[PDB]
């Protein structure tokens, strides 16, 4: 008897056992090497779907740009990029006619949020492509480097503290033909390693001030960093995603804020909803289109994906959409929201980290960069890379490839939803005046479209009308990955609807293991992860109990904190056994101290020290919650009481890089940390609530020191000798500020 688990589907429905078809327990497919080939594949496919457009050169960057929109209509079901401007403007006008006052209210909220948003909002989010370093620094590091390069040139409107003045500085920086940037360079020397007697070239990364051009800074400002996406499920082959620079982040923030205010009031959008709100939206679109106005109404549902969703939507269509949504608004707001589609239409894509070339005679290898690929003879490649380089050769501008058509993955994630919801909103009964109608639900690129009609020919006509109207605006429904059935079972973004029952499998199940901060922090994070998956990610009760047991087992292995009555002999088992043998109430000991597991389904919201506080020994709770413990950092006032337990220690950190002397670049972080520490010494509320100001840090600290000395003199504990010494030292600090 050969065992076949798929025969389980002969008894239960497929949606009742769909979790068997998700192999999400093994390692997800990671990419090896570079993301150069996938970037060139994205660029070539984006220019090949759009090849019947108009080729032009940019007046500023010199880059070859392709203009597919308002082009020839498609003649076959290949994915087209030829979107029509009149159809896009008609769909946005129809979305305005169906929802009156939506555009005005969302634009008014965007204007209310533009004037009150600071530059520090750009320190949030993902890692940003630093045009200074040509690398993906974090958001605050890239923003600080951009502000430093703006301030060392003649651009200082970002000292106003609001975001829109930084964006005006970003736009004014394009006129400087002598942009002086402080990059990172690298020295090298062949030093013998004193562990294996081997010669290795050690590198010393420092800093150097280099001067750009107008065209060089314009290429670096319009550059996305393209890398492969790793740990992506459900695909055989890898893909390249992109990361924006710093000169485009605030404009994209304001455009996506506008589109998020739009999508939060459109009921046909699957954004920005969570799990159970998406289940409620599936139920809402299944109840809206269940109304039998007559006795014979065929209701069909298309579960659909869109093929090449990002390669086919142009930034010019988004420019027309953001100029039509903001109709009747002030022209500064229209221009500010129109900056980001202009920068995305003139964009350029960095071509990754080159390739690796192998010398078999000399038995060596070398990774040559993507800038050196346009001056190496084409016989040194394989056939696919020969085809890719020969296709992309006329698009290269200074080590980057021009990508004027198409969008990259995840940039305008909420505006394309507005376009898709406009296509879904086209087909109402009181608007089409035809024998069919539809209503849908639109995520970023997945859709679930319900077409009602009276005969199956009317359903086919509604299918063709939706598909052709989508093709008019640059939306290609994947005929491979879409299917139509009757109404009652469908799928939308891995939410499986069957007859009033929704199964959520969009989110992968987490490890339910140790997070890796310390003992108390990982205990809190583990119970909060289990509780949040019980609420928002739809974890069962018994599955949550097994997750509690698996997390406690993993937590006891990782921190070597098995129970005192265990027969295992780890490193800490002797001290934990000593603590177990001298404790009266063993139920009060923490899991990190060898106690039992206190947690169950009902008390995952309660911290561990709080949960076992009434069962602890008083000497044990005194030693554990001792406010003079050496493990938690103690801020000087003598220091304060530490209200954190002794399990909230700090692990030893290793930020080292092999053969790399990164001493010249790790200094600025510790200098910034010393500055924030001494500012918190002067202003004690700087860590609780962020300090607002426009003067310098040194000027505010001297103004704090002078009046602190004056208040302490006039009210006690500082004498006039001490007051005079503090004021004379403030004079000396100001004197070194002047002639420094």
């Amino acid at each position: 008897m050969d065992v076949n688990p798929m025969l389980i589907f002969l008894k239960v429905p497929v949606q009742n056992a769909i979790s068997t078809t998700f192999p999400y327990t093994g390692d997800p497919p990671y990419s090896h090497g570079t993301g150069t080939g996938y970037t060139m594949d994205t660029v070539i496919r984006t220019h090949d779907y759009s090849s019947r457009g108009i080729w032009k050169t940019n007046s500023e960057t010199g880059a070859q740009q392709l203009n597919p929109i308002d082009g020839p209509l498609p003649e076959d079901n290949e994915p087209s990029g030829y979107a029509q401007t009149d159809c896009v403007l008609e769909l946005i006008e129809g979305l305005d006619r169906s929802h009156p006052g939506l555009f005005e209210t969302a634009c008014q909220e965007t204007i209310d949020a533009i004037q009150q948003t600071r530059v520090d909002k750009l320190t949030q989010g993902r890692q940003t492509y630093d045009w200074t370093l040509n690398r993906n620094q974090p958001a605050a590091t890239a923003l600080a480097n951009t502000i430093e390069v703006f301030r060392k040139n003649g651009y200082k409107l970002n000292e106003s503290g609001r975001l829109i003045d930084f964006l005006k500085d970003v736009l004014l920086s394009f006129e400087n033909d002598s942009m002086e940037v402080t990059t990172h360079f690298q020295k090298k020397k062949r030093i013998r390693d004193n562990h294996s007697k081997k010669m290795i070239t050690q590198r010393t990364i420092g800093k150097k001030r280099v001067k750009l051009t107008k065209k060089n800074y314009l290429i670096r400002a319009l550059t996305l960093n393209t890398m492969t996406k790793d740990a992506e499920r459900g695909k055989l082959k890898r893909r390249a995603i992109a990361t924006p620079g710093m000169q485009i982040r605030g404009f994209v923030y304001f455009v996506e804020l506008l589109a998020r205010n739009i999508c939060e009031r459109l009921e046909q959008s699957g954004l920005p909803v969570g799990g159970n709100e998406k289940k409620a939206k599936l139920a809402n679109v299944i109840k809206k289109m269940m109304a039998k106005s007559t006795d014979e109404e065929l209701s069909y549902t298309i579960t659909g994906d869109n093929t090449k969703w990002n390669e086919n939507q142009n930034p010019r269509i988004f420019l027309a959409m953001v100029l039509r949504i903001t109709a009747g608004q002030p022209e500064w707001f229209r221009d500010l929201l129109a900056v980001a589609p202009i920068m995305f239409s003139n964009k350029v894509a960095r071509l990754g980290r080159g390739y690796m070339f192998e010398s078999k005679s000399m038995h060596l290898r070398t990774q040559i960069s993507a800038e050196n690929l346009s001056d190496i003879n084409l016989r040194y490649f394989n056939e696919d890379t020969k085809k890719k380089i020969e296709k992309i050769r006329h698009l290269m501008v200074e080590g980057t490839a021009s990508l004027s058509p198409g969008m990259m993955m995840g940039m305008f994630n909420m505006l394309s939803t507005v376009l898709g919801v406009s296509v879904l909103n086209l087909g109402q009964r009181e608007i089409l005046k035809r024998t069919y109608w539809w209503d849908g639900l639109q995520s970023s690129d997945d859709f679930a479209l319900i077409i009602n009609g009276h005969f199956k020919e009317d359903i086919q006509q509604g299918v063709n009308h939706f598909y052709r109207t989508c093709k008019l605006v640059g939306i290609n429904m994947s005929q491979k990955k879409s299917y139509i059935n009757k109404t009652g079972t469908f799928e939308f973004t891995s939410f499986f609807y069957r007859y009033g029952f929704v199964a959520n499998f969009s989110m992968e199940l987490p490890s339910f293991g140790v997070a890796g901060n310390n003992e108390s922090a990982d205990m809190s994070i583990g119970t909060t992860v289990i509780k949040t998956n019980m609420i928002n990610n739809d974890l069962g009760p018994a599955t949550a109990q097994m997750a509690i047991q698996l997390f406690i087992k993993d937590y006891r292995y990782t921190y070597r904190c098995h129970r005192g009555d265990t027969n295992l002999e780890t490193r800490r088992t002797k001290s934990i056994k000593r603590l177990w043998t001298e404790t009266i109430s063993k139920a009060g000991l923490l899991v990190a101290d060898g106690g039992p597991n206190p947690y169950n389904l009902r008390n995952l919201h309660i911290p561990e020290v709080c949960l076992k506080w009434s069962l602890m020994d008083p000497d044990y709770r005194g030693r554990l919650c001792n406010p003079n413990n050496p493990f938690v950092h103690h801020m000087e006032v003598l220091e304060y009481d530490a209200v954190a337990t002794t399990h909230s220690w700090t692990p030893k950190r290793n930020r080292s890089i092999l053969n790399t002397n990164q001493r010249g670049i790790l200094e600025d972080e510790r200098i910034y940390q010393k500055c924030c520490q001494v500012f918190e010494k002067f202003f004690p509320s700087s860590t609780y609530r962020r300090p607002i100001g426009m003067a310098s840090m040194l000027d505010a600290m001297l103004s704090r020191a002078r009046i602190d000395a004056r208040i302490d003199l006039e009210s006690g504990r500082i004498s006039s000798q001490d007051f005079s010494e503090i004021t004379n030292t403030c004079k000396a600090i100001e004197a070194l500020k002047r002639q420094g």
Partner: protein
């Protein structure tokens, strides 16, 4: 000698040229950006790195004061801390046997503000321990994303007022142009200044304690049942996908 230590520290910092440039050029609004400045290779898997760091003898880095608080060797011969190679700074490498030794044979103290700082979680545990559970009822579930009250806060004080109350209590000089505009606000402020007279605690700790007592938070959540504040905390327990546990909180 109170305010001259930090002023001589600032003099020593302004003596350096790069720190002088950074302190004079970066404003108080830009210090909210350079606080999060991180230059260095980031650990892509902290879980795996903790797994292989805990297999080493000394994974903890605590301050040098631990060289005088705990011994260097345990009773069974376990070394508790070692120094670093040519680094006499105030940070040494510690063992987790040191943490277990502090929790079994360190100095006892007074713990009376730990149920006072974390009174929210003790109130949660006292409400759950005295709760009375009803039976489970299985049916299909319709859960609506409602902005429910996760943290209740205080009566007649909004979230915009309680934060100003806390900033007037624990940081009275660092307020700004904000003014207090209620008649029970001043009585609450006087009572909180009275209760926090003798606290040898960090001001952020009493700030966060008054925050988790007074500041009201709300969050969108799928609720199907009672939307009271003492039911959103047991939202992982009183409802599921196909069932609904009936539970009345004790109190």
């Amino acid at each position: 000698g109170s305010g001259m230590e930090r002023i001589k520290e600032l003099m020593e910092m302004v003596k350096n040229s790069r720190m002088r440039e950074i302190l004079t050029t970066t404003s108080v609004d830009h210090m909210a950006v350079i606080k999060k400045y991180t230059s260095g290779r980031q650990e892509k898997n902290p879980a795996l790195r903790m797994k292989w760091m805990m297999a080493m003898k000394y994974p903890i880095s605590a301050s040098s004061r631990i060289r005088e608080m705990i011994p260097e060797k345990d009773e069974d011969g376990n070394t508790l801390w070692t120094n670093t190679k040519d680094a006499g700074s105030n940070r040494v490498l510690v063992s987790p046997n040191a943490v277990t030794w502090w929790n079994r044979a360190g100095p006892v103290s007074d713990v009376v503000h730990y149920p006072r700082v974390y009174k929210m979680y003790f109130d949660r545990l006292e409400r759950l321990t005295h709760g009375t559970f009803g039976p489970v009822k299985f049916y299909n579930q319709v859960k609506v994303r409602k902005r429910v009250d996760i943290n209740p806060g205080h009566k007649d004080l909004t979230s915009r007022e309680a934060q100003e109350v806390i900033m007037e209590v624990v940081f009275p000089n660092e307020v700004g142009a904000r003014t207090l505009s209620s008649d029970a606000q001043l009585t609450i402020t006087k009572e909180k200044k009275e209760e926090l007279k003798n606290c040898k605690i960090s001001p952020i700790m009493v700030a966060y304690m008054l925050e988790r007592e007074l500041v009201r938070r709300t969050r969108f959540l799928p609720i199907a049942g009672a939307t009271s504040s003492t039911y959103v905390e047991v939202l992982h327990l009183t409802q599921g996908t196909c069932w609904e546990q009936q539970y009345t909180p004790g109190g």
